[PDB]
mmCIF file of C-alpha atoms and ligand atoms in Angstrom:
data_model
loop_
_atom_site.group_PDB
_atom_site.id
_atom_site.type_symbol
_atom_site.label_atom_id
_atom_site.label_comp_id
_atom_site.label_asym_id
_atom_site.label_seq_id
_atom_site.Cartn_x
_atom_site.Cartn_y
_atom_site.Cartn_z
ATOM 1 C CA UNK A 232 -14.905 10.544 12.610
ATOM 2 C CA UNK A 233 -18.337 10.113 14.463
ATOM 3 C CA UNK A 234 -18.057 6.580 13.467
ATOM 4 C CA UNK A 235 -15.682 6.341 16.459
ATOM 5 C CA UNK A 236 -16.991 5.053 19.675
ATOM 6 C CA UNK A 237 -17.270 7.682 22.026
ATOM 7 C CA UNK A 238 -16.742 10.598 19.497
ATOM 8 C CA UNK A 239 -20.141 12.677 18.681
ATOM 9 C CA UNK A 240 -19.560 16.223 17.011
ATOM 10 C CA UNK A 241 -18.226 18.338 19.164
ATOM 11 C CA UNK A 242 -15.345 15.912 19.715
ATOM 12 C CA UNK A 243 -14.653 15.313 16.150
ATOM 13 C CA UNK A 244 -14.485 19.000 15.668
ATOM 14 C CA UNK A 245 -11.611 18.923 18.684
ATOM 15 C CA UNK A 246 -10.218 15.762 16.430
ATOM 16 C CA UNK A 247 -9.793 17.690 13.334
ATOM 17 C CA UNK A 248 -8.188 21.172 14.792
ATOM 18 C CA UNK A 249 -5.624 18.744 16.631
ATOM 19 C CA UNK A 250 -4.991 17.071 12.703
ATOM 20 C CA UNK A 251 -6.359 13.741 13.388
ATOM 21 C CA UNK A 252 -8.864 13.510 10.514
ATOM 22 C CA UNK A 253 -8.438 9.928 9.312
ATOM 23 C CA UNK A 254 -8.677 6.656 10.908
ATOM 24 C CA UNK A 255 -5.469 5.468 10.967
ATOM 25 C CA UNK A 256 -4.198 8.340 12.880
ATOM 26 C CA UNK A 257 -5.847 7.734 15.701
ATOM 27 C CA UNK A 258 -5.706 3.773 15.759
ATOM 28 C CA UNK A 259 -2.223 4.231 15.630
ATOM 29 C CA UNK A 260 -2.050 7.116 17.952
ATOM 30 C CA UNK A 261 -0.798 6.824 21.637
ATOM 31 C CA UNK A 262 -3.913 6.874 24.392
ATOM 32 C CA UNK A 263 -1.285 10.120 25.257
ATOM 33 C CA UNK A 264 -1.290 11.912 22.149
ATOM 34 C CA UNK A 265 -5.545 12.552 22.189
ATOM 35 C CA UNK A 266 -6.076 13.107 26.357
ATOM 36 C CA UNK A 267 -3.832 16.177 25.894
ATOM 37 C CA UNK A 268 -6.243 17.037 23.022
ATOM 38 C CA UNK A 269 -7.940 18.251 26.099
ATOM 39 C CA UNK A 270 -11.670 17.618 26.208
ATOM 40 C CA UNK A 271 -10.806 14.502 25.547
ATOM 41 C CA UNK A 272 -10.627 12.301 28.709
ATOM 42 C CA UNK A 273 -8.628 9.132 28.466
ATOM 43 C CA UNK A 274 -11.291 7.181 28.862
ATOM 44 C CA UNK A 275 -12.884 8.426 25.348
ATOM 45 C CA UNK A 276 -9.410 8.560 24.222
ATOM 46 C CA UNK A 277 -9.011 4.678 24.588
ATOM 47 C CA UNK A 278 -12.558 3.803 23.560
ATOM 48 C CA UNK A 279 -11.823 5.959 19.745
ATOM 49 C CA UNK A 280 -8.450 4.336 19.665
ATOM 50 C CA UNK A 281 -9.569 0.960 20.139
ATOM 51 C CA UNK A 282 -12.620 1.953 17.660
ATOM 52 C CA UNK A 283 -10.842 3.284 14.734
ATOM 53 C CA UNK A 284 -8.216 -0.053 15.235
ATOM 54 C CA UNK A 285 -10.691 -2.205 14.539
ATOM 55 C CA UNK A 286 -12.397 0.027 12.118
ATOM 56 C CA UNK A 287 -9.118 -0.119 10.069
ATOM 57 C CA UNK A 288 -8.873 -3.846 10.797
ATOM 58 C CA UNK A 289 -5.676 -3.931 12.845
ATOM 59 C CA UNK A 290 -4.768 -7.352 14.504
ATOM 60 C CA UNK A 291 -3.091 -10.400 13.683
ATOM 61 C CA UNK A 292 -2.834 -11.791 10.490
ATOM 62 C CA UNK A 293 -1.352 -15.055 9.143
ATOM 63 C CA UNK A 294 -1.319 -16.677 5.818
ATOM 64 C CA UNK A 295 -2.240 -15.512 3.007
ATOM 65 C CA UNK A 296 -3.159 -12.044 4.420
ATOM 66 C CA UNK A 297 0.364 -11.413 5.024
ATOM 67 C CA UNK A 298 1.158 -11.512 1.112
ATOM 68 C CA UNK A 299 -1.884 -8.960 0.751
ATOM 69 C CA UNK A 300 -0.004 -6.644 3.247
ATOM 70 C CA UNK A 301 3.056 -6.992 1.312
ATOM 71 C CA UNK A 302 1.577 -6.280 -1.449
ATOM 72 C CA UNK A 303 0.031 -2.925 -0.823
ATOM 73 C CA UNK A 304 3.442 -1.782 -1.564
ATOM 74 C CA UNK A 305 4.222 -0.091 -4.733
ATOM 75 C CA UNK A 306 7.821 0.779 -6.270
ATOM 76 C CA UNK A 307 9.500 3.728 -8.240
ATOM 77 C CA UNK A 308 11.572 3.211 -10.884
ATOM 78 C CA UNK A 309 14.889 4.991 -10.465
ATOM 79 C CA UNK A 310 15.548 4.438 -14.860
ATOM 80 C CA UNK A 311 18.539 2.856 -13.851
ATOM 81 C CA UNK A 312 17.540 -1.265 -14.567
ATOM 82 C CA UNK A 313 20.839 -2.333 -13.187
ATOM 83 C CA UNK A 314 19.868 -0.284 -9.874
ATOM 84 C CA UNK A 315 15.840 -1.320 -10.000
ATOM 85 C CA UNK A 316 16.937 -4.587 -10.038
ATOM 86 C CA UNK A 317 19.705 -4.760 -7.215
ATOM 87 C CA UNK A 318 16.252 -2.834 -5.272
ATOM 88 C CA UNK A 319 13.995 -5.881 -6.589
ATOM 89 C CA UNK A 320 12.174 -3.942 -8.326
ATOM 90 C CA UNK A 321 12.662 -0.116 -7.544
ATOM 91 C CA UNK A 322 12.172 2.155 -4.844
ATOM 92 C CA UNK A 323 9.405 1.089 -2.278
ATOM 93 C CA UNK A 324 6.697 2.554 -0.466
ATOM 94 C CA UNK A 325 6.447 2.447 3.657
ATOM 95 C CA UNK A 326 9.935 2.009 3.819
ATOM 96 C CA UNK A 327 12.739 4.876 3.870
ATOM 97 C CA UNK A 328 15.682 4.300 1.348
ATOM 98 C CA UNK A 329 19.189 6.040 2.233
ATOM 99 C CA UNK A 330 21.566 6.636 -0.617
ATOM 100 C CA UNK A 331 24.877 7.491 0.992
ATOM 101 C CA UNK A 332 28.550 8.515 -0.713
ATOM 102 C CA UNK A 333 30.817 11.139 -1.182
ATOM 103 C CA UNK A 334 30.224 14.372 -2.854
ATOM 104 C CA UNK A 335 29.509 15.045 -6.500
ATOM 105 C CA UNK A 336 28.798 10.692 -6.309
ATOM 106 C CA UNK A 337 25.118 11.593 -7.479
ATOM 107 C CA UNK A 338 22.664 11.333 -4.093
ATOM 108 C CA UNK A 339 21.132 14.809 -5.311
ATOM 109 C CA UNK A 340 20.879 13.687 -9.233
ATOM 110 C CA UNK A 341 18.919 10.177 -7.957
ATOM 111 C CA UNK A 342 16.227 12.705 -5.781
ATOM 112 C CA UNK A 343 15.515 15.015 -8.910
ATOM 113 C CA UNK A 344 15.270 11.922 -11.078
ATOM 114 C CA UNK A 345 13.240 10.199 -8.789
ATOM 115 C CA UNK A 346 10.641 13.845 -8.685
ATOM 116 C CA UNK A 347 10.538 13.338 -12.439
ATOM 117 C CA UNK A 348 9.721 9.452 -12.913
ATOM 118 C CA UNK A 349 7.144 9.464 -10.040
ATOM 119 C CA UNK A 350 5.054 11.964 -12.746
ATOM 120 C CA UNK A 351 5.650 9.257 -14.963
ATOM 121 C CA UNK A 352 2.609 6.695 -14.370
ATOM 122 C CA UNK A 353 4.471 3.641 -15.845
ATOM 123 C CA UNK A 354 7.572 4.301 -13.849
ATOM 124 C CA UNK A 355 5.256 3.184 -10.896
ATOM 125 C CA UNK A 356 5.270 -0.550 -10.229
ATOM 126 C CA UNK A 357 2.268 -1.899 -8.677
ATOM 127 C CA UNK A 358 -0.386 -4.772 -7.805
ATOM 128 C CA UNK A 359 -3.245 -3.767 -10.021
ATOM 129 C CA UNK A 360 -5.415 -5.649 -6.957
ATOM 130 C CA UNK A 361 -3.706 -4.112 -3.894
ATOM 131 C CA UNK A 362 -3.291 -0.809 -4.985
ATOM 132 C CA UNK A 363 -5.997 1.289 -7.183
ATOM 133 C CA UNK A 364 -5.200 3.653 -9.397
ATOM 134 C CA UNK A 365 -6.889 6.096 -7.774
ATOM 135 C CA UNK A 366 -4.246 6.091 -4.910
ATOM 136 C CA UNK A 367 -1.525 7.047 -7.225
ATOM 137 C CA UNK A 368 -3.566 9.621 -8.896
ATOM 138 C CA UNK A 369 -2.115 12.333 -9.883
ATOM 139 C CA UNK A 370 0.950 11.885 -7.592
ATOM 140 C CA UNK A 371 3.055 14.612 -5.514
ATOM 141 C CA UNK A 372 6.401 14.825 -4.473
ATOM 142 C CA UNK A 373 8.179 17.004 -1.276
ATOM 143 C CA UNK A 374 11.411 18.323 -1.729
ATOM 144 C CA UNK A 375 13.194 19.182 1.422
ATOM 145 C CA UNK A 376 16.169 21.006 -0.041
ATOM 146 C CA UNK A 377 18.607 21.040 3.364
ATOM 147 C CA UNK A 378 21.858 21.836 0.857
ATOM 148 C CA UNK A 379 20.214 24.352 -1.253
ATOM 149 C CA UNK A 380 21.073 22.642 -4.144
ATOM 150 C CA UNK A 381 17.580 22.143 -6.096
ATOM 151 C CA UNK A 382 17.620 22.919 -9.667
ATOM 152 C CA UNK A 383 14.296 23.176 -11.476
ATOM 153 C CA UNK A 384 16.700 23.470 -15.060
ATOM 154 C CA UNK A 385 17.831 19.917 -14.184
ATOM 155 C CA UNK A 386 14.359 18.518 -13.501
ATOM 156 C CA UNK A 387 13.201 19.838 -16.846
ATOM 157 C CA UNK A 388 15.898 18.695 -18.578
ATOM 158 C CA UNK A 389 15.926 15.521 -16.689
ATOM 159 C CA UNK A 390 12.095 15.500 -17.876
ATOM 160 C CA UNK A 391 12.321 16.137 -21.242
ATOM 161 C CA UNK A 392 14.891 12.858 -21.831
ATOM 162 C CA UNK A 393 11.971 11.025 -20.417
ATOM 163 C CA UNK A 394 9.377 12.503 -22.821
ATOM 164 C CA UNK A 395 7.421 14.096 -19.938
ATOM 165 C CA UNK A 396 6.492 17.690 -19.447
ATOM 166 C CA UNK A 397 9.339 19.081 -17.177
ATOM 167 C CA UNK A 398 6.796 22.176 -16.379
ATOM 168 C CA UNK A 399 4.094 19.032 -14.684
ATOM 169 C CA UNK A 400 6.856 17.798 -12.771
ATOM 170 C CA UNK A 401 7.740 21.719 -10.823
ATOM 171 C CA UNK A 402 3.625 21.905 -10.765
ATOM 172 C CA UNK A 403 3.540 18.677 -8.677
ATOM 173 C CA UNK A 404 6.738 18.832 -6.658
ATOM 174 C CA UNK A 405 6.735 21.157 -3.331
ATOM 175 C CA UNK A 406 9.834 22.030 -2.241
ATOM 176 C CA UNK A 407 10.879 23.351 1.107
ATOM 177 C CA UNK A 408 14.472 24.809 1.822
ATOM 178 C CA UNK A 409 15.706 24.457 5.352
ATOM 179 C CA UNK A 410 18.520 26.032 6.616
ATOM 180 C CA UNK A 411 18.473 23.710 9.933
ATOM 181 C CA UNK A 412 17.590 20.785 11.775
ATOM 182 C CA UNK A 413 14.180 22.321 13.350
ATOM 183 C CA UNK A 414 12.809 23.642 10.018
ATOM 184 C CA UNK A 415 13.889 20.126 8.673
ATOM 185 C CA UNK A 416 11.746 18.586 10.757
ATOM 186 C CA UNK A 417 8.881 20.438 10.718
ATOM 187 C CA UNK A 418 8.723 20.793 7.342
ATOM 188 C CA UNK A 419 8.713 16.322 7.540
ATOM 189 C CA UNK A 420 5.958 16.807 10.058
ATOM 190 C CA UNK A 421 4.113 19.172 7.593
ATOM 191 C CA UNK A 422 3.885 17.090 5.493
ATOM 192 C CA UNK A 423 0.557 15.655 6.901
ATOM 193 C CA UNK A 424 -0.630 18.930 6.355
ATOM 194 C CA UNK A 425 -0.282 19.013 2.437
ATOM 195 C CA UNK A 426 -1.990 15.822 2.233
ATOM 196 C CA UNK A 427 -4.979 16.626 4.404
ATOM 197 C CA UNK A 428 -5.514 19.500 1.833
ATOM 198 C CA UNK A 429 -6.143 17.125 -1.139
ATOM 199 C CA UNK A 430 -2.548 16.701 -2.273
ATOM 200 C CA UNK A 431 -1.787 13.086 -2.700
ATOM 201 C CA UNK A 432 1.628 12.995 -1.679
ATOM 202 C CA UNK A 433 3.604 10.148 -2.964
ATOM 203 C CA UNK A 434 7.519 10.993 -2.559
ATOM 204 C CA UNK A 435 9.203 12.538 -0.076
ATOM 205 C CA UNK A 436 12.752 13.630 -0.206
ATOM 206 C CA UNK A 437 15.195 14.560 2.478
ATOM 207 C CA UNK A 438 18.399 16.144 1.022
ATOM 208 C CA UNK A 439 20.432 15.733 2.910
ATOM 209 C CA UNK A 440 18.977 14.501 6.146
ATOM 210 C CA UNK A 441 22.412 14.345 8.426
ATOM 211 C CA UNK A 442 24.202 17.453 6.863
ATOM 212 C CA UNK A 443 22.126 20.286 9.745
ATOM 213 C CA UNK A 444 22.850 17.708 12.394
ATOM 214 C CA UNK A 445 26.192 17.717 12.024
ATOM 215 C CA UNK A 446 26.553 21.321 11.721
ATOM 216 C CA UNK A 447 24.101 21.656 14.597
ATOM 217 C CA UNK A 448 25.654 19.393 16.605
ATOM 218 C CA UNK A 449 29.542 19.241 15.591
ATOM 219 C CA UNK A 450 30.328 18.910 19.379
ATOM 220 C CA UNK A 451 30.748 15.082 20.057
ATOM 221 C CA UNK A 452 29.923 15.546 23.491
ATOM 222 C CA UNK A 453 26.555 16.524 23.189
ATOM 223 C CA UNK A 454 26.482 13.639 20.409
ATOM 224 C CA UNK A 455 23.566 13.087 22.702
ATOM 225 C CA UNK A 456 20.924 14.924 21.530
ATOM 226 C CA UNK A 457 21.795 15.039 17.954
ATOM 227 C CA UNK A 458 21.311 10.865 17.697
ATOM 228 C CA UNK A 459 18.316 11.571 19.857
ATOM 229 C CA UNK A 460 16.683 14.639 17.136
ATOM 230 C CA UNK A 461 17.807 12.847 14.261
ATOM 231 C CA UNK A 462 15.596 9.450 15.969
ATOM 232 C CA UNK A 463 12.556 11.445 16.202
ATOM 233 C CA UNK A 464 12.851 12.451 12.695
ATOM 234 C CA UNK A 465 13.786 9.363 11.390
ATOM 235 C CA UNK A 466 10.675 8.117 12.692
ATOM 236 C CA UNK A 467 8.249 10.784 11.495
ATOM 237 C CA UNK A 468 9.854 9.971 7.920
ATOM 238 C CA UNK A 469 9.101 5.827 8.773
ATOM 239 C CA UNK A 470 5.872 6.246 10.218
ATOM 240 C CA UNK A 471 4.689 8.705 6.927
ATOM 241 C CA UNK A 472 5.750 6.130 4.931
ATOM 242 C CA UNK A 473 3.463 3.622 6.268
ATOM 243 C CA UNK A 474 0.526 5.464 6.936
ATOM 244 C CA UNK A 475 0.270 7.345 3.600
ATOM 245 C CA UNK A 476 1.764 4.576 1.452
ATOM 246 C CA UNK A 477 4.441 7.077 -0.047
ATOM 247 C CA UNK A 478 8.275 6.257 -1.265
ATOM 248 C CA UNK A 479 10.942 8.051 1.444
ATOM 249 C CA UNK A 480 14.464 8.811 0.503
ATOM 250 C CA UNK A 481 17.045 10.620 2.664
ATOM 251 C CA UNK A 482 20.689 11.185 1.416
ATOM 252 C CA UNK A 483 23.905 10.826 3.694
ATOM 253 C CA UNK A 484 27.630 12.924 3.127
ATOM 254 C CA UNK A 485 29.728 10.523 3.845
ATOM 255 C CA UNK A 486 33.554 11.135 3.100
ATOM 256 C CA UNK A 487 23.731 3.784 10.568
ATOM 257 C CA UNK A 488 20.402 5.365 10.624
ATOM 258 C CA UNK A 489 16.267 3.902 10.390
ATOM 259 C CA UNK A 490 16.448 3.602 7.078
ATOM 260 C CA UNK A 491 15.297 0.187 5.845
ATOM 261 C CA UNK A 492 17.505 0.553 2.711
ATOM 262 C CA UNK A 493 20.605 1.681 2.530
ATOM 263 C CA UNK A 494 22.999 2.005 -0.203
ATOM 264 C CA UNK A 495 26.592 3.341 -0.966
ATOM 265 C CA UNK A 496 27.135 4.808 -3.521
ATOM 266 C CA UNK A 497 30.797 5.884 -5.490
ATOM 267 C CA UNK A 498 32.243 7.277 -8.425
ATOM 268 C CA UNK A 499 33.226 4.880 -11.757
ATOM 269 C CA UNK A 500 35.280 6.239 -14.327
ATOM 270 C CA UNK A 501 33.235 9.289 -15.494
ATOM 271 C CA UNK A 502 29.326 8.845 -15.803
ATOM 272 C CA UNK A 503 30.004 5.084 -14.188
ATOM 273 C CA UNK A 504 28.538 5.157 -11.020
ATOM 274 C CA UNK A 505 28.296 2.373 -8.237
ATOM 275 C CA UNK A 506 25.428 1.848 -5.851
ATOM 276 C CA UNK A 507 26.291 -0.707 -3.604
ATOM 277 C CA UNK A 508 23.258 -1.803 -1.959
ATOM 278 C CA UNK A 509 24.624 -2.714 1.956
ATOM 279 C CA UNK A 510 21.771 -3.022 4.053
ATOM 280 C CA UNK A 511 17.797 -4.298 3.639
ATOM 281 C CA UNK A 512 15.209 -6.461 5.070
ATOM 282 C CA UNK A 513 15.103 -9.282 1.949
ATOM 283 C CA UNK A 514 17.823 -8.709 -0.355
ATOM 284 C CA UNK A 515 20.973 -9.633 -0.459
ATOM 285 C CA UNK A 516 24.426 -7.288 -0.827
ATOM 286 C CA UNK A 517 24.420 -6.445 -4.248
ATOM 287 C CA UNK A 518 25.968 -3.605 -6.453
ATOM 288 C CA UNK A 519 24.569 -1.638 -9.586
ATOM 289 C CA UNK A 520 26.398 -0.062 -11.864
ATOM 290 C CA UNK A 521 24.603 3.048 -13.534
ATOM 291 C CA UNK A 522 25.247 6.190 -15.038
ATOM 292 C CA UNK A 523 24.846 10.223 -14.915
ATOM 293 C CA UNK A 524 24.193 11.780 -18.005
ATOM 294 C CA UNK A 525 22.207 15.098 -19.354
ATOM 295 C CA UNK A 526 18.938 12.517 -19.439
ATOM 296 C CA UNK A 527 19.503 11.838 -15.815
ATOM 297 C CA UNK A 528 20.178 8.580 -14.125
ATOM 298 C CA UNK A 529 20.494 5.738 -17.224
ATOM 299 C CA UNK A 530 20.972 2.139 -18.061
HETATM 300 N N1 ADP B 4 23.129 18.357 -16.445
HETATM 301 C C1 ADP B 4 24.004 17.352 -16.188
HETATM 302 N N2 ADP B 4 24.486 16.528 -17.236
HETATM 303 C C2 ADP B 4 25.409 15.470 -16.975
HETATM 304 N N3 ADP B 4 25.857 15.222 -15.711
HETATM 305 C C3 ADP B 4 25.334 16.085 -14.695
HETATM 306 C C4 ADP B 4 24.435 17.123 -14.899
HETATM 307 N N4 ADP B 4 24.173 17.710 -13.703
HETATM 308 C C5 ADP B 4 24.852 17.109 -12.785
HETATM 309 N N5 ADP B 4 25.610 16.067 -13.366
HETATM 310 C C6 ADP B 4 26.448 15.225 -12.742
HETATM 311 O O1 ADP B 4 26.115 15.139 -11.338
HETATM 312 C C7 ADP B 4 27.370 15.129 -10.571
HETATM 313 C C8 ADP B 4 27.149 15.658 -9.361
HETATM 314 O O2 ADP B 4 25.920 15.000 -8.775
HETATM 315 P P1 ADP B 4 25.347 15.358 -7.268
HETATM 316 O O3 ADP B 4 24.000 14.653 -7.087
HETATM 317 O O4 ADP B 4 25.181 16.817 -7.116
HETATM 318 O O5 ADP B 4 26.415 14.817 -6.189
HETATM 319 P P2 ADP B 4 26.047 14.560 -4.646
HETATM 320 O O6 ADP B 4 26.089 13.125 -4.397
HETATM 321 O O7 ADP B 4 27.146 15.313 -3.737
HETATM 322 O O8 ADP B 4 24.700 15.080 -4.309
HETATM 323 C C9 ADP B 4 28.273 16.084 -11.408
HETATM 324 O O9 ADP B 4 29.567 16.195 -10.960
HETATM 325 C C10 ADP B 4 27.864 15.807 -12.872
HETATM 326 O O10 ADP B 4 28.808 14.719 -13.419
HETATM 327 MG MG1 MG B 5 7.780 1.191 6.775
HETATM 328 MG MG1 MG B 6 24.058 16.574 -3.141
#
C-alpha cells in the first residue's frame, strides 16, 4: 500500500484495520469511504484514490482492449450442456446470475451442483491468456444457506457422480446459515474477509436471497425499505463479483432484481426441468431443458 501517493506506514497500517488491503479497493472506493477512516484527510484520501486508479490502470479503453476486458471472465459449467449453452457457455464471473421458479423446481439442486463442479478444474471455462491458473487455484465456494436447506449428503453424492471427492468439495465450501436479512448481508459483506485470509473465493451463493425480505418486510407499505436493503445487497453481491473475479448466484421463490442473468425455471414431466433464460446483457431468450437426477443436474 505505500506505493500509494500520499500513504507512508502509519497510514497503510490505518488502511489495513479499515480492510482496504488491495488496490482495487481503494481505486474504486468513494473519496467518502477513506476520510471517515479518520486520520485520513480528504486530501490524502483523493491523492491514494487517484494513485491506486492509475496503479490498476483504470481509464478508457477502446479497441482491442475491450475484448481483453471481456475476456478476463471465466465460466462454470452447470453439467447441464443444454443449460451451458442457452448461458453461452456457463455461469460467468463479475456478473450475478438469478435462477427463479417455484418450489421443489430445482434453484437449491443447481447451487449444490454448482459447489461441486467449481472443485472440478475442467468444469471451469477460461482464456488460458486472460486468466492464469493460479487465479483459480484451488478454488472456494460460500454458501449462504437463508432456507436452511444445505445438505452435505447431496453434495457428496452429487460429487461422487462426477468422479470427484465429495469430502474436497465440504473442505472448500463455507457455508453460513442466516436466519434474516441483516445476517444475510453481512455474511455477503464478509465475504471480503475470507478472501483477505488466503482463501481464494470463487463462488458465492445466496439461497435464497428474497425469501428474509419478504418475511422481514411482508408489510407493502413499508415496501420501502425492503427494495431499498435488498439494493444495497444486491450491489455488494455485483461489486464482489467484479472485484474478485468470482461466479454470483442468488435464487428467487416465485409462485426484477440486479442480477445480470436471470432465468425461470419450471417443472417438466418428472426429472425434465425448464430453465428459461428471460433476461441478459448478450443473449437472446432461450430455454434449456435439463434434468434432476441422484448425479445432480444432467444432460
Ligand atoms: N438425491 C436426489 N436424487 C434425485 N432427485 C433429487 C435428489 N434430491 C433432490 N432431488 C430433486 O430435487 C427436487 C427438489 O429440488 P430443490 O432445489 O430443493 O427445489 P427448489 O427450487 O424449491 O430449491 C426434488 O423434489 C427431487 O426431485
Ligand atoms: Mg459485474
Ligand atoms: Mg430451495
Amino acid at each position: 500500500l505505500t506505493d500509494l501517493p500520499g500513504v507512508g506506514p502509519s497510514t497503510a497500517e490505518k488502511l489495513v484495520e479499515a480492510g482496504y488491503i488491495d488496490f482495487m479497493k481503494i481505486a474504486t472506493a468513494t473519496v467518502g469511504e477513506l476520510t471517515d477512516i479518520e486520520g485520513i484527510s480528504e486530501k490524502a484520501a483523493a491523492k491514494m484514490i487517484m494513485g491506486a486508479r492509475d496503479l490498476c490502470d483504470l481509464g478508457f479503453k477502446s479497441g482491442i482492449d475491450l475484448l481483453k476486458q471481456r475476456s478476463t471472465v471465466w465460466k462454470l459449467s452447470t453439467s447441464s450442456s443444454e443449460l451451458d449453452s442457452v448461458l453461452g457457455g456457463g455461469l460467468e464471473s463479475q456478473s450475478v446470475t438469478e435462477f427463479a421458479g417455484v418450489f421443489g423446481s430445482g434453484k437449491t439442486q443447481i447451487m449444490h451442483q454448482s459447489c461441486v463442479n467449481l472443485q472440478n478444474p475442467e468444469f471451469l471455462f477460461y482464456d488460458e491468456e486472460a486468466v492464469s491458473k493460479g487465479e483459480v487455484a484451488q478454488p472456494k465456494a460460500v454458501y449462504i444457506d437463508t432456507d436452511g436447506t444445505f445438505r452435505p449428503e447431496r453434495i457428496m453424492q452429487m460429487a461422487e457422480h462426477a468422479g470427484i471427492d465429495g469430502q474436497t468439495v465440504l473442505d472448500n465450501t463455507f457455508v453460513a446459515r442466516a436466519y434474516n436479512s441483516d445476517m444475510q448481508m453481512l455474511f455477503a459483506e464478509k465475504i471480503e474477509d475470507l478472501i483477505q485470509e488466503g482463501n481464494n473465493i470463487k463462488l458465492v451463493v445466496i439461497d435464497s436471497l428474497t425469501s428474509t425480505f419478504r418475511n422481514e418486510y411482508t408489510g407493502r407499505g413499508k415496501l420501502a425499505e425492503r427494495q431499498q436493503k435488498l439494493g444495497r445487497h444486491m450491489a455488494t453481491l455485483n461489486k464482489l463479483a467484479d472485484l474478485f473475479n468470482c461466479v454470483v448466484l442468488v435464487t428467487n421463490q416465485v409462485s426484477g432484481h440486479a442480477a445480470t442473468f436471470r432465468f425461470f425455471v419450471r417443472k417438466g414431466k418428472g426429472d425434465k426441468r425448464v430453465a428459461k433464460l428471460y433476461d441478459s446483457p448478450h443473449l437472446p431468450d432461450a430455454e434449456a431443458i435439463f434434468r434432476i437426477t441422484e448425479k445432480g443436474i444432467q444432460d
